[PDB]
Design a binder for this molecule. Structure first.
Ligand SMILES: Nc1ccn([C@H]2C[C@H](O)[C@@H](COP(=O)(O)OP(=O)(O)OP(=O)(O)O)O2)c(=O)n1
Ligand SMILES: [Ca+2]
Ligand SMILES: [Ca+2]
Ligand SMILES: [Ca+2]
Length: 438
DNA sequence: GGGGTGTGGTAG
DNA sequence: ATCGCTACCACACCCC
């Protein structure tokens, strides 16, 4: 299905695991809001809480293995390096098992890159996606978590991951013996309920330490590390980009500024708050500083104190940066129209209008090959964005699609140089019962 | 003090 | 072959 075919968006989203991830996450958040419309559902100043951060180990790889076709009968999850991917070369490894990771393979690597990490005779097993079973195993996960009746708040993070909060009465002497019991119950009940998937669990009294504890626990384990338990041994165990919020760009800046720390212990012994803030910015610097103390920042805590506002959707968009090869502006405009139709179907499902929209595009870099290394990839591009305030909030196709096509024209991208498009509704407006307006 | 725009970055 | 999405904080830099 080419990008000028009316079925392209349907086919692309059907095959895109990144689309599936975002849609699943959005749907879990909507369900949380719907199930909690009447309930208080939030941590109070008065609560002392424990965080149980629970997450499937190598989720797609595990499920796709447990569900593999007869052709993969013989595959051994504990001995073979297994990846889930569409392709054979410049195709993303969506998930890899811990055997593969023992050779240095990582989620997001191209199969082409991963294969070079393997010694002679060691063969990469590549399993197809099983999207519907990913969903079904997630359902079993979330159902088990609720049925245990041990959590005061269950927060969806993604298809395979939840932050679960237990409030501890001041009446009650929490102990790690009780926490280990709960961890082991959760792991067993989910292993049973999912027919063979494993989860790991990080357990702490901050979100950030629960996240690091989760990392330490993997694969197929649990780790309890409270602030009281912090030690050089703990911090020495983590790379810099194990901290939530530290990706590759922030890592690069930390390594430049602090002489290539090789563990969170190195960073914590070397940094100063002000140098940190200079390196990575004021809020991120404060976040990292607080994290290196085992403590959450104000922004991260909002999910505990006001989950309904955190989880409420504030924008709606689609992004298509793969398979984009148009010959003329007629075809670009029709695709923009198809994208607007899709977005408006979603906007109407949530009973909202929009007052502000954006078109963003990827354009081939002047010196970048027409056909990039990744088949149908966007390749190396320059990004361009323009937004427009609509005035009266609307859900009218005619208004929105017209302004989107106009936004496209102002960015000046020749159709044959286009490599990607995003269509965004940046501001959403409730629809109430009263619609009488002059 | 309040508003605005486009862009960087991260996560899963 | 191959399916490189998408929500949202923070930021720089503009206005008054
Ligand atoms: N670069 C990525 C990262 C994740 N995912 C999908 C596949 C993962 O199975 C799943 C969940 O993401 P996680 O980051 O939780 O990773 P895994 O569950 O695969 O491994 P881990 O045991 O490290 O949590 O999301 C993907 O397609 N591409
Ligand atoms: Ca996981
Ligand atoms: Ca996860
Ligand atoms: Ca990180």
């Amino acid at each position: 299905v080419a990008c000028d075919d009316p079925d392209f968006l349907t086919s692309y989203f059907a095959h895109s695991r990144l689309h599936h991830l975002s849609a699943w996450k959005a749907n879990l958040k909507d369900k949380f809001l719907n199930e909690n419309i009447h309930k208080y559902t939030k941590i109070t100043d008065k609560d002392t809480y424990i965080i149980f951060h629970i997450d499937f180990d190598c989720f797609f790889a595990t499920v796709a293995y447990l569900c593999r076709s007869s052709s993969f009968s013989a595959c051994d999850f504990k001995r073979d390096p297994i990846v889930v991917c569409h392709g054979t070369k410049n195709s993303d490894i969506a998930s890899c098992n811990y055997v593969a990771r023992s050779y240095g393979i990582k989620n997001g690597m191209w199969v082409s890159q991963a294969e070079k990490m393997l010694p002679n005779g060691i063969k990469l097993i590549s399993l197809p996606y099983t999207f519907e079973q990913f969903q079904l195993k997630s359902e079993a996960f979330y159902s088990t978590l609720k049925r245990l009746n041990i959590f005061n708040l269950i927060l969806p993070i993604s298809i395979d991951e939840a932050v679960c909060v237990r409030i501890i009465p001041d009446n009650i002497h929490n102990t790690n013996t009780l926490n280990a019991r709960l961890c082991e119950e959760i792991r067993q009940e989910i292993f049973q309920g999912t027919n063979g998937c494993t989860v790991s669990i990080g357990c702490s009294d901050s979100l950030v330490l629960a996240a690091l504890a989760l990392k330490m626990a993997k694969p197929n384990g649990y780790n309890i590390t409270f602030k009281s338990n912090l030690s050089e041994e703990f911090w020495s165990s983590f790379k810099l980009d194990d901290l939530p919020g530290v990706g590759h760009s922030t890592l690069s800046r930390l390594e430049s500024t602090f002489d290539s720390p090789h563990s969170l212990n190195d960073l914590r012994k070397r940094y100063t708050l002000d140098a940190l803030k200079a390196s990575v910015g004021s809020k991120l610097g404060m976040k990292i500083h607080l994290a290196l103390q085992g403590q959450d920042d104000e922004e991260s805590l909002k999910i505990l104190y006001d989950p309904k506002e955190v989880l409420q959707r504030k924008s709606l968009s689609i992004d298509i940066n793969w398979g984009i090869r148009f010959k003329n502006i007629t075809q670009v405009d029709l695709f923009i129209e198809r994208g607007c139709q899709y977005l408006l179907e979603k906007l109407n499902e949530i009973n909202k209008t929009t007052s502000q929209i954006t078109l963003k595009l990827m354009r081939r870099c002047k010196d970048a090959p027409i056909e990039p290394p990744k088949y149908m990839g966007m390749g190396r591009c320059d990004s361009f964005s323009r937004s427009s305030r609509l005035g009266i909030p609307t859900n009218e196709f005619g208004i929105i699609a017209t302004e989107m096509k106009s936004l496209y024209r102002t960015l000046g991208c020749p159709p044959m140089e286009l490599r990607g498009l995003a269509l965004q509704f940046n501001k959403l407006v409730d629809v109430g019962p009263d619609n009488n307006q002059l």
